[PDB]
Swiss-Prot record, chain A:
This protein's GO CC annotations: mitochondrial inner membrane; mitochondrial large ribosomal subunit; mitochondrion
Further details from the record: Present with 6000 molecules/cell in log phase SD medium.
Predominant place of localization: mitochondrion
Full-sequence range covered: 49 to 213 of 249
Protein name: Large ribosomal subunit protein uL10m
Entry keyword annotation includes Mitochondrion: yes
Assembly notes: Component of the mitochondrial large ribosomal subunit (mt-LSU). Mature yeast 74S mitochondrial ribosomes consist of a small (37S) and a large (54S) subunit. The 37S small subunit contains a 15S ribosomal RNA (15S mt-rRNA) and 34 different proteins. The 54S large subunit contains a 21S rRNA (21S mt-rRNA) and 46 different proteins.
Swiss-Prot record, chain B:
Family label: Belongs to the bacterial ribosomal protein bL36 family.
Organism encoding this protein: Saccharomyces cerevisiae (strain ATCC 204508 / S288c)
Subunit structure: Component of the mitochondrial large ribosomal subunit (mt-LSU). Mature yeast 74S mitochondrial ribosomes consist of a small (37S) and a large (54S) subunit. The 37S small subunit contains a 15S ribosomal RNA (15S mt-rRNA) and 34 different proteins. The 54S large subunit contains a 21S rRNA (21S mt-rRNA) and 46 different proteins. bL36m has a zinc binding site.
Protein name per its UniProtKB record: Large ribosomal subunit protein bL36m
Name of the gene encoding the protein in the UniProt record: RTC6
Superkingdom of origin: Eukaryota
Reported function: Component of the mitochondrial ribosome (mitoribosome), a dedicated translation machinery responsible for the synthesis of mitochondrial genome-encoded proteins, including at least some of the essential transmembrane subunits of the mitochondrial respiratory chain. The mitoribosomes are attached to the mitochondrial inner membrane and translation products are cotranslationally integrated into the membrane. bL36m may be involved in a process influencing telomere capping.
Protein's cellular compartments: Mitochondrion
Other facts: Present with 500 molecules/cell in log phase SD medium.
Curated annotation (Swiss-Prot), chain C:
Family to which this protein belongs: Belongs to the universal ribosomal protein uL6 family.
GO molecular function: rRNA binding; structural constituent of ribosome
UniProt-listed Pfam families: Ribosomal_L6 (PF00347)
Chief localisation class: mitochondrion
Species for this entry: Saccharomyces cerevisiae (strain ATCC 204508 / S288c) (Baker's yeast)
Other facts noted in the record for this chain: Present with 5700 molecules/cell in log phase SD medium.
The protein, known as: Large ribosomal subunit protein uL6m
Superkingdom classification of source: Eukaryota
Swiss-Prot record, chain D:
Domain of life: Eukaryota
Listed PANTHER family: 60S RIBOSOMAL PROTEIN L12, LARGE RIBOSOMAL SUBUNIT PROTEIN UL11M
Protein name: Large ribosomal subunit protein uL11m
A GO molecular-function annotation: structural constituent of ribosome
Record-linked HAMAP family: Ribosomal_uL11
N-terminal signal peptide: none
Matches recorded under Gene3D superfamilies: Ribosomal protein L11, C-terminal domain, Ribosomal protein L11/L12, N-terminal domain
Length: 165, 38, 196, 138
RNA sequence: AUUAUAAUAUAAUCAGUUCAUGGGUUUGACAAUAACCUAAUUUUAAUGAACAUGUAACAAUGCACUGAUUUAUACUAAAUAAAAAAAUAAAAUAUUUAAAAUCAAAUAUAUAUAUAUUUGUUAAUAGAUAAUAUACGGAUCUUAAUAAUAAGAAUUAUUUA
């Protein structure tokens, strides 16, 4: 299918930081609302993610958005982990990786962590390993900045030039 | 400089250069790896 | 090719023009040739400076988004393709210089190793372990300043010229391995040997 | 500007435990830049029992300061099989898969190896048999 | 051939592992020796349940490539990418340097295309080196729009008049 819905999948793997991604099946509706609230804090909505076209979306990187014409079968397999999810996945329109943003999301996630199924770390801006995700959790990105898009970004104007005489 | 007919790059930090009609092998790490083709 | 294809961003204060030379010169290789006709200029706040360039190259100035592109008449021609990546990079460097300015910090390392502005900026005297006095005149465009005696700064609009000058300055005493000792241009490093 | 930096963790050749200053390991924490005395109060609360000061890999993790999170692991991986038994791997003493699984339960009983599945611990147990003079019976 | 339209750029270099042995010293690299295996969070005890297909364990994606170091640590570190009007063609790792084979072109026979014969597969530099004096026989020869009636090998390879 792909089309616009795979564009929402692209929204999950955009810029900025902090992502969600959890199995749609067995997802507490109260927790789901709280997850939506967590994305609403930065502005956004939960987006359902299904496989078959999700693997196609992951297959093509920085390429023209695929649509119904594009077929999962017509695309080559090779990478066997192309479908990261094992079924229906409900993920808020979150961004990349940020411990500060995920902290609140984790609190909601931890409450019903048994019910939902988290998505394993998938290489995004940097290589992400599901097996080594423990190390990635212990060593995440620097969350010193919280403004992200607003301010900082490119208007941070950091004139480091010479700092040692 | 080791001036010689054979001029192979030893380590990964070695790099081959073509100047003055001569193959030079300079190196960023080990200074012993400097060579010149004749 | 991959470099030359990258489009150059311009801020309204800076203007990248192009026009034919007064007396075009031709570089003659063994088989191939290269006729220098056009003359690109990069005028801006800090200064203005130019690049003499071949005929096959030409700009593509767009009004929208401040982008300009550079292309050659034949990318499959090897020499042209090689030139293309150079010229684009050169004009980017010029843009950077005119808007921001190029910089070259030299830190002196050693007992009594230091620089001094002798002729009111026009001659960088350098004292680096020599009975005879050492130094050289600053070129036109280059402005030198010394925050400390042991830490000199060279500044200019041309990235080529400033960094050449810095290299020349260093050449009086490059860093020794045994003691990290000499003249270090920008982020320069040296693997120190064991004393023994 | 602040980001996950680096500090230190004391263990060198895997150390022991039982809570004490430890010669010159405590001073080695001094080389790291932290003491090792009052930690033994909490460390004793984390180091004792029937085992005679078991050398559970001293996980002496250090924060960017004296304040530090000090821990350990399951009874010395190899020692588990060594204690149970007092070519295939290192042959010698052979540990039945049942006893291997029992040792896996002990390893998984410890919170550190609780995350490690008993099946995966059984595979790790074969590894200790491969290293120390032990054998794992299929 | 294989892997290709998915690399320099990019962090992290980890789960047996600290590989095992010996070993003052050795966790990468001390020499010897060995060389593949687990780990898939959101959550745990000293005298018993393969280990389950969970939509997937598996994945060498490293016996830290390799130094480093007293040995480790530090430390680079196989995992590997961003970036594709797609292949038709501009990736790597090699082997290769061939018309035998295969293929194309052609001859010859029966000839609505049957066999047989023949032809078709690398370049430059370095290596370079003595004694009256440079010595392709000498001059000298590699071409450039603008621009002459007008030059454009005078070298090598295969050929024409």
């Amino acid at each position: 299918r792909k089309t616009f819905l795979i564009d929402t999948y692209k929204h999950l793997m955009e810029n900025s930081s902090m992502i969600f991604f959890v199995h749609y099946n067995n997802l507490s509706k109260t927790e789901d609302h709280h997850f939506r609230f967590k994305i609403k804090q930065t502005g956004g909505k939960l987006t359902k993610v299904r496989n078959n076209l999700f693997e196609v979306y992951l297959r093509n990187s920085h390429l023209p958005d695929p649509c119904g014409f594009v077929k999962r079968k017509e695309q080559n397999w090779k990478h066997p982990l192309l479908p990261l999810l094992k079924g229906p996945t409900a993920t808020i329109t979150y961004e990349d990786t940020n411990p500060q943003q995920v902290a609140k999301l984790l609190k909601v996630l931890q409450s019903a962590q048994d019910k939902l199924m988290v998505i394993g770390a998938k290489v995004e801006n940097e290589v992400l390993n599901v097996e080594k995700i423990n190390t990635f959790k212990t060593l995440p990105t620097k969350p010193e900045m919280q403004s992200q898009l607003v301010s900082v970004l490119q208007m941070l104007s950091g004139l480091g030039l010479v700092r040692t005489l | 400089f080791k001036v010689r007919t054979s001029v192979k790059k030893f380590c990964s930090d070695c790099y081959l250069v073509r100047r003055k009609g001569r193959v030079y092998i300079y190196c960023k790490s080990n200074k012993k790896h400097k060579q010149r083709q004749g | 090719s991959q470099v030359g294809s990258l489009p150059l961003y311009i801020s309204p204060e800076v203007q990248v023009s192009i026009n034919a030379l007064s007396m075009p010169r031709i570089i003659r290789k063994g088989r191939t040739s290269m006729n220098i006709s056009q003359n690109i200029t990069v005028k801006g706040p800090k200064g203005e400076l130019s690049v003499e360039v071949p005929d096959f190259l030409h700009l593509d100035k767009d009004e929208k988004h401040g982008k300009i592109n550079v292309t050659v008449q034949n990318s499959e021609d090897k020499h042209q393709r090689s030139m293309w990546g150079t010229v684009r990079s050169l004009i980017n460097n010029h843009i950077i210089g005119v808007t921001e300015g190029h910089l070259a910090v030299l830190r002196f390392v050693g007992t009594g190793y230091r620089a001094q502005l002798e002729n009111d900026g026009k001659f960088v005297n350098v004292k680096v372990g020599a009975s005879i006095k050492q130094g050289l005149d600053v070129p036109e465009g280059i402005v030198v300043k010394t925050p400390a005696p042991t830490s000199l700064i060279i500044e200019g609009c041309n990235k080529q010229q400033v960094l050449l000058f810095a290299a020349k300055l260093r050449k009086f005493h490059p860093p020794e391995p045994y003691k990290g000792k000499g003249i270090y241009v920008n982020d320069e490093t040296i693997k120190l040997k064991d004393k023994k | 500007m602040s980001q996950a930096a680096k500090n230190v963790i004391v263990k060198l050749i895997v150390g022991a435990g039982q809570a004490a200053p430890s010669p010159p390991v405590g001073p080695a924490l001094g080389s790291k830049g932290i003491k090792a005395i009052d930690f033994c109060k909490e460390f004793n609360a984390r180091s004792a029992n029937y085992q005679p000061g078991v050398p559970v890999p001293v996980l002496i993790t250090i924060k960017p300061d004296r304040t530090f999170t000090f821990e350990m692991k399951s009874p010395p991986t190899g020692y588990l099989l060594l204690k149970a038994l007092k070519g295939p791997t290192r042959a010698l003493g052979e540990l039945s898969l049942k006893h291997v699984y029992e040792i896996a339960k002990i390893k998984k009983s410890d919170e550190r190896h609780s995350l490690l599945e008993m099946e995966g611990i059984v595979k790790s147990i074969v590894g200790v048999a491969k290293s120390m003079g032990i054998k794992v019976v299929p």
